[model samples]
Target: SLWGDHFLSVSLDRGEFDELEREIETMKPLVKDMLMSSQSSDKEKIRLIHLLVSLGSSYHFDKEIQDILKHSFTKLDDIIVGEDDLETISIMFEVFRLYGHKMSCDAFDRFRGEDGRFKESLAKDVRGMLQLFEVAHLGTPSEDIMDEASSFAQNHLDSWIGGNVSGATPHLLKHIQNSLYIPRYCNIEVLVAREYISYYEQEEGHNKILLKFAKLNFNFCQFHYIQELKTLTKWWKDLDLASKLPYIRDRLVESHLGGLGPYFEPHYSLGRIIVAKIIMTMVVVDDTYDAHATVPEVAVLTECLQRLNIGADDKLPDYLRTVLESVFEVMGEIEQEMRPKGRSYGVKQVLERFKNVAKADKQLTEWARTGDVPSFDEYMKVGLVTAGMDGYAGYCFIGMEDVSEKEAFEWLSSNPLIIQALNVMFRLANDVGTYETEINRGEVANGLNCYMKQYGVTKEEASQELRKIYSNNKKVVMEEFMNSHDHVPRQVLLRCLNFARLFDVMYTEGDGYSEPKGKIEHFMTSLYVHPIPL
Candidate 1:
């Protein structure tokens, strides 16, 4: 049963939302002029385009940006992104990659020497070194060149920040610090937009008009998110969920924000709401398995879901009956909406995933009740599915038009390696962040305890091993993300990338999903609650 105590309302003034729209109208022409200007150099255009995206204004100029990227992709090698300029090259690489081009890691080779290493001089360029660090993160699994760059750039930047490096601006230092912890590609877009606008403002080269435009764009889109949250809040409130399923965790806002994270464009408005419901429902379902329900109860629920037994609810416990009822009601609404969009089948795939998840939950419940942990390999066979990446990735594409076709759904069900890598990342990261809390709360065995028990190692040693596992798995995800385009559409592949990225943001420091009120409070407030100053 779904249950949550919650409230949702827009915090921004309606007046500000209106004013921001007017301000955005005022700001669009500045970027449009630059876009049309033949006089603007490619480098300058690239700079503007990068800023537009980082500033959260690119969605407002989709055609203009795509038009620019399509042209840029053709002459990518011809562009004079000089070998010496890390910023230009890095920005170009990201722009191309974001738009679905498999830009090569060898692009950095021009900066290398006969010794096959980056020049020692490049390290002294702290800004450029930071840019290299960001660029290294974009590599595919086979791109061993990035392995060297990742280590070299990271080493130099770590030392530079430790010392009082001259000429490093406060803004530059901030960028380095943030990037060091989480790559720009892995960040939540809206939060990155908020920081980028502020960071860009502090720079000497920052364009005032573009800066103003980005701020307005951010707040305007933010209004949309707030409104969506308000609507979802009402839906959750009306469900009267918390009183019925009191044993489960209540993460209404977190789920709503998460569902919106992967695709927040205004066009995905309906999809985002649908995602919120799905994510929240999953949270409830997860809790019932992880903490609340008994092994027999989970077994029965999984059986009911597997059979799609609407008539069998009367046989379940009151708590379990309510959960089953909500699943039907919520998914029924979802199926109806998706049918007109030609994505009803995608929702069916989602149902299959839920059933799969219920089965995994039963396995976990059985493990917790029996005794010691399963071996890592044994645990991961089922853990990957239970991690919930496949279902979430499927949901990410469900409502989008032309993106989630039959083939895409087929590929999703293919148990693609990328999903496995991502599951590994999410599972290890989750264990790293939440093992103690899960144990304290009397939950099932996680990666940490499992690894510890299997290896007869201390908790600290097992944790280091898990982190190594996460790092290697990330390489798999990166490779699959870049290399799997032979069959998977770039748009579809991005859902997986964004899914992994979401795990990165959610579990970077700790179990943000479980304790979002701590650090995530700031992330939530920054992206939705607070308005950028005019």
Candidate 2:
């Protein structure tokens, strides 16, 4: 029921699209002046920046926005706390943290009263409450202030959305609908643009030029995405994975969506292409070991994958030969692509990561074979690798420019807190999303099952517990990235951030990647198929 023949149908005229782009370029600076002018107060600048970000126009002024925030931070010194409304302070907190500034949760002091809880009167400020809720996602794992804000805002918003709406304003209703579906921090830029264009149209005073630009820009990017998908479709069909590997989930398109996590900027085209291929290959081999293969056969296949030797391995099964062959072929393609850029050394880290996954696969097969229900702790140790995140991160490092440094690769192998947190979050999300189907299939233990077994709880309780674990780890993931400014490249940190974002987006509504229909279909169609009408 969750499958569909989803295809990209975008076919805009290149000449027309380029004309629209020219129009955007002309009108964009007038909007840029609102952010750049010295006459604008920092508060005005903050609001404009927030609006620009919500409209998905921040990509057009990254340097300007960065400089403005940097300057504002210097002048305000994080002092824009009690003097401002909750909306302003909340927006400032999120914007600053996102730009890698060390924002303190103490900025939230004015909103709270004596009892370590938020003031009850603040609930009337729905806009402020909503911003506080959204900003809470940016907090570190240890910030109790964010915890209190999250609890308070979520409690009130849930009531507001669920209760009688006779008092609800139009703007409040729209913001509520959008926020519940796609909050800003977890949003992909292009997807946001596609969705927000119409939302902007509904606004009383939406800028005609800005709305048109959003449409034109979305269509412009869709053109390139369609072309990329066309090429990728040809490549995927040529592989014939559907017919050849009947058991593996055919997720060629979804893989590309994952690769497109960070942004839809033109330069990341190769990153998108290569990351898609990497994920596709990993999915095939991962399911082979996880779902289909016998213990002994998987053991041998794991060893072969560990070897990462392309030629005929005497030990591997004839069936596995094709899998290993495709892996090497794709890896070689990626390596060749990066070799010319003098980043070929990165491939070794990827291979090592692959070997680690193979080893994790062996452990999983052993558990499946023996019916050993591992403790949550014991499970996550192996689950981290078996979830395939570390390998995905490694593959990501190989494709990009920033993480090519030996230090990045070194940190990767060390199981640094960042990747470890990412692995846990990814693992927990995947398990939560797929637990029902997986259990039905009599597959290996997942986080949900492991918790149920160890904690003696019902499936619903265990599911809730796993989600809580995932929720807590989300903060860790963000914390490590924010604190990692000196430890790794910002681009590397962005990849981790984007991966978490993409992971949540994909898995939040069930296993969207494998289903490929309903919401997932609609989402992909919005991004790559349907163009916004200007």
Candidate 1 regions off by >4 Å? 1-19, 80-82, 114-116, 163-168, 290-292, 311-314, 337-343, 402-405, 484-487, 510-517
Give lDDT tens digits, candidate 1, residues 309-428.
664535668877888788888888888988987788878777777787778878877787665478877887877778878788877777778584677768867888988888888878
Instruction: Enumerate residue pairs that collide in model 1.
Output: 1-323, 3-241, 3-242, 4-242
**lDDT of all predictions:** 0.75, 0.73
Candidate 1 weakest ten by summed lDDT = 1-10
lDDT of 2 at 493: 78
Query: 1-534 in candidate 2: lDDT tens per residue?
Result: 022233334344778757867877897888787778989789888877776766667778888898888778886654573565888888888787877776788878878889756888887788898899889778787887887787788788878877687155666677666875666666666666666676767778887776776776677677766766666666666776666555767576778787777547655677777777777777888777754567768867877777787645456565577787787887787788788887788765666767877888788777776777798779888888776666677666665674555776777767778777778878887776777677776565778788888989987787777777776887888888888875677777778888788777777753122222334666866776666755
C-alpha positional error of residue 244 in candidate 2 after TM-score superposition, expressed in Å = 3.5
- What TM-score, to 2 decimals, does candidate 2 have? 0.90
Error of 1 at 83 (Å): 3.3
